Amino acid sequence: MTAAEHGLHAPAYAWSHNGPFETFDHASIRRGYQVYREVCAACHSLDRVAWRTLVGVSHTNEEVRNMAEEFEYDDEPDEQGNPKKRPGKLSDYIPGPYPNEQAARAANQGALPPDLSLIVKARHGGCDYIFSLLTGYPDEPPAGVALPPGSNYNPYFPGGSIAMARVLFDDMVEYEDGTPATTSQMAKDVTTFLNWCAEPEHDERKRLGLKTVIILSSLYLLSIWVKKFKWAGIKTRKFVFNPPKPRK
Amino acid sequence: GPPSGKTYMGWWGHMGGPKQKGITSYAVSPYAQKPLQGIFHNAVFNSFRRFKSQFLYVLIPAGIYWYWWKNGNEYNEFLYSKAGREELERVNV
Amino acid sequence: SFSSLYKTFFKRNAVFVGTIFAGAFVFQTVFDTAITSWYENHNKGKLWKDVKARIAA
């Protein structure tokens, strides 16, 4: 199969958290969420994670309540049976702006936009390839390729055609500091943010893994020693065949 | 108990192996000797002797199939590289 | 002499198992503390403990 429909192999970026002991730099999630909410507002979903897990990993506490006071979630029916809406709490999920599925194909002028909540686990070369795709777009499509009107080109996507309106410009987010307005920053932050949301459990997973590796290596060496020990009772034996007298 | 079929290995005492006489064994007990004897000398020397003895049996098949795999990959690459209008058609059928 | 150590620890299995369990407990606690500390200071500014202070002003 040709490389055109196969997609360029992702270059092996020396990522910050791609290390045996390195942890997520969630000094950057604090702005990754900011940029995600600011730019990808009414396009994707992220409809899997609950706000009672951002506190203690990215944010302090009262901020999540202050944000949840901005969404409504259709509380239990009242006495008269008329359904009502109440502000969100610390047991709710982020609402993807498209209600169920249909507005998705209605507005994107294309296909359904996948739920980002697990997207960077379900692509080959997951950690990268989303930074690659978000910044790898060229300004002008390669000469000699015809595409449907209204669509956009991406050499890194299998088939080289994607409906991603390239909203990754500069002078747009301005997080709180002097750092945005360069298209690498927002892409990198969103990449780490998504890589976290696929498993908001990396820190303790790595800690536990280190503990297990150390314990098991120590126990391995001890077991090797003990096997060399009690097996020595037979490995060093000898035999001296003294033939019997030929009498029968 | 219910008698069962014939078996090629008995239990202790009636083990079933050929009877032998004059064979003498020995032992020195685990506690009277160093557990790690040779540890390095035997490690390196026996490891290299063993790897030398059976090198070819794993070298040859791996080389043959690597040669196949490389040739197949290179021909596949050449097929879909500015050759889809003059070579791909005449061999796809 | 090691004869005293043997006859006080390894002659009797009950004390041997008691010591092995107590050592397991103390080892587990201290080992967990040490590993957590090492994994923590190994990442200065990468853990929320210092970010929460930096954001405060």
């Binding site: 060093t236 | 020195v28 009277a32 000797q33 | 090691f2």
Partner: peptide, 24 residues
């Protein structure tokens, strides 16, 4: 070589210090 002649274990035998501490 009569059976009583134990083969030379001196290569693997522990040094001339018995084993009253090795159990430990």
């Amino acid at each position: 070589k009569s059976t009583y002649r134990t083969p030379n274990f001196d290569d693997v035998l522990k040094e001339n210090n018995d084993a009253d501490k090795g159990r430990s």
